[PDB]
Amino acid sequence: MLEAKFEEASLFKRIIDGFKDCVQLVNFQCKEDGIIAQAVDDSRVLLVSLEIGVEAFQEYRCDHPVTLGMDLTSLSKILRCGNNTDTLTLIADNTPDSIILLFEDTKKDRIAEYSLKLMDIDADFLKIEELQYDSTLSLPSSEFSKIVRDLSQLSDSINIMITKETIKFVADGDIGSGTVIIKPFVDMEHPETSIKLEMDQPVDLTFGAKYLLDIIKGSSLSDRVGIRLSSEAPALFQFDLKSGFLQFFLAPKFN
Template sequence: LRASYHHHQYQTLNLTPISNYCHPHSFNHYSNLQYRIFPAKSEEHPIRQWTARLTLTPCYVVLEARLEQAQLLKKVVDAIKDLVQDCNFDCNDSGIALQAMDNSHVALVSMMLKSESFSPFRCDRNIALGINLTSLQKVLRCAQNEDILTLKAEDAPDVVNMVFESADSDRLSEYDIKLMDIDQEHLGIPDTEYAATINMPSSEFQRICRDLTALSESVSIECTKEGVKFACNGDIGSGAVTLRSHTDVEKPDRNVEINLSEPVALTFSLKYLVNFCKASGLSDSVRLCLSNEVPLLVEYALSNNSYLRFYLAPKIGDEE
């Protein structure tokens, strides 16, 4: 705290509050506080005291969210940064959410990190943090995967504060990222009863998309009672991968589960699916949901009922 006073010969001040009616962490509730100032002792001047009124600048943290491991947010940003450049992180008492479309309006990403994913988590009011994802990725690269990550934002913020705390040493890093004003429409995603739902290893889905992209720009996903078939046809040839529902008790991470109410066959851009697969490191399994004439849902389940979802519009007519 700084005080203006006329006795400039006193260089050291000891401040004792007279009116301490406010909690020390609640500076936003008042702007003036009365203090009694005790100048430093000196032989020339005996101890005197007088009263000064100090004006405090409000500085109140409305968001504080602590992740036990920074790698969660690092992987989420890595998975979506090539689809979306700028987006709002919408924070409320339920957690931190994100929803944005790519520039072509072909794909939509929806993320929800529930408040239970953080410890502690506090959000005193709804707040939107507009962030450039490339800038965010650069800062997150300064954190080790095992670092403890804490996000903080003040009321009406122009920056978001990020603190990286090493779990096994005394290293503490602190960064501020400038925020942006992003006018972003929040789309209501309707609940859909999908005709086909496939649960499969995320590594297997990533491998299929990577292999088929060498042959074509598009992939046909056909789901029948025989299984799910990923097929493509390109200039150099064609290819197909078929998976059947199976359960392995000893290796449950390799299970493939297919729930089908009616056959489905749709064609999608492999470029987008390959991008979605960057989220494979977040979850061992991935869920694909399909219905005719409805966007494909690709969902990666995270801990504490959190999730990262991608929606992709199917190709139609001449696009296929």
């Protein structure tokens, strides 16, 4: 029997929020040590990998491994019934045909139980993470969110360019252009509003603006965003969770 209870029903919405705007159906592999889920969009340029440690829950028990794939369109709907902060509990049994989503408020006088029809879905799980990435930077997810949204106003191509201690986001549009140059530093009022950067090799990569706009959905999960870039390999955008994370592997343009 599976019983995964999020303390605050909100974060389960926010994580499937990063999924739904691109990927469609997705296998959630639940095992004793937590949940992992992976999905890839149609064009196979964006790959979303989730990991939820047991410490991210209020309570978690999984007697044995249970893979439960499901339509995020249908799931999200049940997550609309979820008014935020209602101890959402995922419940399933051995070889289940359905998953139960159970909400509960502070006052016991209200409790709602929902059920979601599951799917049989093959999935060739991927493991494309590199050992080392040419560059690695950390910045506020709100800042990165802004940069993407603003430069997205122009052409549908944003070009990240990293030289030593210099990160440069550029969009060159048909109507005009825009460039945001930020630099690594250290804050103290809130050290987690600062910018970090480790550069083994400089990078000059272009990404589809459409997808960068979808990657920043996860900015509601963490204060920071972890971007790892490689010239030959897809970029790793990561939003860290209390235990585990939400990753977005994006392939840069060929050009």
